[PDB]
Design a protein around this nucleic acid. Structure first.
Lengths: 62, 91, 100
RNA sequence: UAUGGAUUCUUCACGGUAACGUAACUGAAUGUGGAGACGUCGGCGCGAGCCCUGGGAGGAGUUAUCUUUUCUUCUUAACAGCUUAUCACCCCGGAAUUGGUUUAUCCGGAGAUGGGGUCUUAUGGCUGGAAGAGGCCAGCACCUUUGCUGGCUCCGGUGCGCUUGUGACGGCCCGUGAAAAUCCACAGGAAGGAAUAGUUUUCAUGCCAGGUCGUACUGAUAACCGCAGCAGGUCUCCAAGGUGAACAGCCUCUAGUUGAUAGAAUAAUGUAGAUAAGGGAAGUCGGCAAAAUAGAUCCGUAACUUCGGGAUAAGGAUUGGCUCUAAGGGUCGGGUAGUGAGGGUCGCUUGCUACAACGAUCAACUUA
RNA sequence: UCAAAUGAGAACUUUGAAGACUGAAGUGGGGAAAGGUUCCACGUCAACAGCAGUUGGACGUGGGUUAGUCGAUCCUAAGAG
RNA sequence: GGUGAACUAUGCCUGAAUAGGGUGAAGCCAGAGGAAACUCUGGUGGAGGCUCGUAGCGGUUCUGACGUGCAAAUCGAUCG
């Protein structure tokens, strides 16, 4: 309605934008979280790669 | 974009009259060309058929009103006054 | 589909007086039939079935016997044999000659 | 007046949820609505005609050369039966992710989307009427009356095209935009009706009868009037093609004209035109008169303003022919599973498989 | 503008042969008022048709408008009484 | 003592007429900025006792022609 568009084929290139960003952005979010997981846990072995200052002292004397 | 600067809807008149005249009466246009509410459906269709004729299609009402607004404040105070004095005579 | 169209014309009418060669008219066309652009571009879509007495063309190319009339008019203009022959229609795509 | 049906002891129909529907299926006073029956303007859409064009066919002209050439026939009344719309209406439904949606912004929980249906038939289409009509040619037959004898009347397309009727919006008014004439339909259940009949016969078909006038013509530089067969006046309606934005100009075809005492010479004279070196308003009361410009395309613009103007301010640049290039749309799809709703065929993802980026085709004049 | 005819008569009467115009918001087709037999067919040219006129809407004659279905009268408006 | 509103001035009721252009008024949307207020920007959209300008309608002028005219009020240019 407003103006926001040129003509038919230009708007078809815009359909390639809507397609391209639904696909190529939504799948990008999904793979983003899917790659966050368990590198979480590599950072756990990291924070237990220098605070085992606390894990090398205390519990299992018995 | 924005069409007119200060002339607004009376840009149909342009440079035609004493500018005091256009300056007053453009407001009168704004008054008589507003849409108001039916209080019975809640919607709004009330608008001037004539000066004191305030037409309405949403739930189909029409009130003899003022000239360019529907109700004048005189009708509001004779309203509140016949009503309130009605609550001073009836009450 | 590829049906050769039949156009049936009697040409005996001056030839019976010996004053006309239908081999000169079918020869006159066999270089001149405006099929596919070039006149006489007549690669095996046509039949030139003359007799000397009746010529009939059965040809799967774009043709009308009214264009065959247009082939007569330049001929009888050219040899100037107009005004002894009308290219008369028996019926549709059926024609004949005269002698008068 | 007959006929047939109707509708009934459910006295004077059926159904659908409602949509709504039919060949039917009584009614005083009192009302009732509707029609008639009335503003303008704007866009937008749609009907009808015209104009434009192709193929097919019959008719005719061109032709040194070209010229499938330039033209010609290809029609369907009132009236019947079918079909057909905006709009509208009832089920389902509850909506915010708000959605639906105009060209131009509108609507929906007082139910939107949407999914179902119900409905006016404007309108248009189909068929009949109504082909025999008409027409178109083509052929003979001869005083031939001219009679005979055929054929054709087919399929297109196209549109910011023209003319016209619609739809639905939108504008405007301290302006808000006829009358009667007429006919319904519903109350009304007055009043009257079936039971062996009953019947309105808004259901059908079937009888007869259609005052009086007016009606030809002109409608105008001769049928009107002006004193006149007077260059004066006199109300209404229809528009081919080129050209061009244009009903502007100009030409061309149909339509229709082709009428203005005649003749011979060409002197001033005027009248009606044009042309002029050079200079340019001195001339003239006075640039009277005359001269100059101009369309389109791109640039630019002063003062003042009551802000809107001024402004086209003013003032700058462009305009042949040809051969090319770009953009600017529409219909159809996206199968080896013999697959779907079937169960000559049949279609989506289509590579009884159940369903997942595009390509095939027709079409413009528009700028660059 | 040319040939023919016709008549004693052809500038002015016909027919052929040409060129032009309006060019369609027509010199087109018409219709309303208005006119009214002009309409149309014939015999004629006194006189007109400012030359002519053999021709006219000229002179003598005839012919011509068809309605249940189309307008009037219905209605009412302005108005009238 | 009679007649004219057919000419002309005025009212009412029924009817008829008006190319092609410039103009962009309002409405509404799209974007940007701003906290909003608002600010622009891009549109849509088609206003005007608007304008050019045609049909039209009048007549300002040349003091045009005429000036016993086609004319007891014509014709030319011109204008609004």
């Amino acid at each position: 309605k407003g103006n926001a568009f040129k003509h038919k084929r230009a708007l078809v290139e815009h359909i390639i934008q809507a397609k391209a960003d639904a696909q190529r952005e939504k799948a990008l979010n999904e793979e983003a979280e899917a790659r966050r997981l368990k590198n979480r846990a590599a950072r756990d072995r990291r924070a237990q790669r220098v605070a085992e200052k606390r894990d090398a002292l205390l519990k299992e004397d018995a | 974009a924005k069409r007119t600067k200060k002339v607004g809807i009376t840009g149909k008149y342009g440079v035609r009259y004493g500018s005091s005249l256009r300056r007053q009466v453009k407001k009168l246009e704004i008054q008589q060309h507003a849409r108001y509410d039916c209080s019975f459906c809640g919607k709004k269709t009330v608008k001037r058929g004539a000066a004191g004729i305030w037409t309405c299609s949403c739930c189909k009402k029409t009130v003899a009103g003022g000239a360019y607004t529907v109700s004048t404040a005189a009708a509001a105070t004779v309203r509140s006054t016949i009503r309130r004095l009605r609550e001073m005579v009836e009450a | 589909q590829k049906i050769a169209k039949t156009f049936t014309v009697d040409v005996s009418s001056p030839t019976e007086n010996g004053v006309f060669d239908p081999a000169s008219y079918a020869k006159y066309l066999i270089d001149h039939i405006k099929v596919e652009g070039a006149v006489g571009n007549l690669g095996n879509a046509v039949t030139v079935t003359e007799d000397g007495t009746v010529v009939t063309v059965v040809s799967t190319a774009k043709f009308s016997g009214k264009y065959l009339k247009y082939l007569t008019k330049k001929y009888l203009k050219k040899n100037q044999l107009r005004d002894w022959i009308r290219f008369v229609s028996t019926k549709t795509n059926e024609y004949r000659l005269a002698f008068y």
